[PDB]
Structure formats: structure tokens, C-alpha cells
Design a binder for this molecule. Structure first.
Ligand SMILES: Nc1ncnc2c1ncn2[C@@H]1O[C@H](COP(=O)(O)OS(=O)(=O)O)[C@@H](OP(=O)(O)O)[C@H]1O
Length: 155
């Protein structure tokens, strides 16, 4: 096993414990992990900062951004794996299109799906921002820094 790099894509708007769980479960399986923000409630720089403060405890996790094909990013940084989470509330056909296309564009990159834990298998950033907008207790869905920002925004 040479030096392995895995990219965990998303628009992380914002990053939730759901995403965070996938990142943490991945750190010990690749030498290098890149959380890449591609393609909104929070600005791009805002979202990177939120991810950053949320993964300070994970030394091998980098936070970068990219505009363009995710596969081009992977080819640039030498990443050969794309990590995606599979949840009960996932859009299966959407995942099929997305991943099948990435495979066509560059098959030297494998997308690996990790199934979400039962407690995060039902949330998404949308539903979370929604209840946050109505000032519900959201400490269960997002890390401290993110919750602080969401509240700040939806005050
Ligand atoms: N691991 C995990 N846990 C919980 N939720 C997750 C996870 N990964 C992706 N998502 C949510 O799936 C929706 C689409 O993801 P993205 O907007 O990042 O697009 S992309 O497919 O990742 O490119 C989007 O939620 P929506 O708010 O319903 O659009 C992402 O926040």
C-alpha cells in the first residue's frame, strides 16, 4: 500500500454530525483525507471554516475547495478514492447517476460508499437548517461551532 489519499466531497452547507461521522470513520483507513467543498446558505469560505473548526481533532484531515469536476481535483492531488455516505434518506437514483458518471470520466478513481450510522441516517443539511431557522434545539445534529453559526445567522 502506497500513500493513499481519499476525498470526501459535499457542499457541506453546513457540515452536520452526519458528515462528521463519515469523516471520522475514514481517517484511519487512508493516510490522507481531503474534505472538499464543491459547487447556498453559507458562503464557500464560511463553510470551509465551519469544517475546519469541526475537524481540528483529526490531524490527517485537510479542508480544501474546488470548482470543476471532482475527479479533476482527485487527479491533481493524487487521490484515488472518493468517500460518500449512504443513508436511509439518500436519493438512490441521484447517487447512481453521479457515481456512474464519475466512473466514466475517470475509472482510476473509485467511489466507496460508507453506510451512515442509524442515528444520522435520516438527516440532511436542508432539514437541519430548516428547524434551526425556527430556533429549535439543534445541538443534536451539528457540532458546537456549526450550531453557534446557525444560531448567529437565524437569530
Ligand atoms: N454523510 C451525510 N450525512 C447527512 N447528510 C449528508 C451526508 N452527505 C451528504 N448529505 C446531504 O445530501 C444532500 C446532497 O449532498 P451535497 O449537497 O453535498 O451534494 S453532493 O451529492 O455531496 O455533491 C445534502 O443535503 P440536502 O440539505 O438534503 O440537500 C447533503 O447535506
Amino acid at each position: 500500500m502506497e500513500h493513499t489519499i481519499a476525498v470526501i466531497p459535499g457542499s457541506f452547507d453546513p457540515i452536520t454530525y452526519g458528515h462528521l461521522d463519515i469523516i471520522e470513520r475514514s481517517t484511519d483507513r487512508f493516510d490522507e483525507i481531503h474534505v472538499c467543498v464543491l459547487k447556498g446558505t453559507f458562503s464557500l469560505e464560511e463553510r470551509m471554516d465551519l469544517i475546519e473548526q469541526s475537524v481540528k481533532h483529526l490531524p490527517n484531515v485537510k479542508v480544501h475547495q474546488f470548482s470543476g469536476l471532482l475527479v479533476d481535483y482527485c487527479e491533481q492531488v493524487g487521490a484515488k478514492t472518493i468517500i460518500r455516505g449512504l443513508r436511509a434518506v439518500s436519493d438512490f437514483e441521484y447517487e447512481l447517476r453521479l457515481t456512474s458518471m464519475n466512473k466514466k470520466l475517470n475509472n482510476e478513481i473509485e467511489t466507496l460508499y460508507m453506510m451512515s450510522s442509524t442515528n444520522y441516517s435520516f438527516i440532511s443539511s436542508s432539514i437541519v437548517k430548516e428547524v434551526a431557522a425556527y430556533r429549535a434545539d439543534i445541538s443534536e445534529f451539528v457540532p458546537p461551532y456549526v450550531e453557534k453559526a446557525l444560531k448567529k445567522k437565524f437569530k
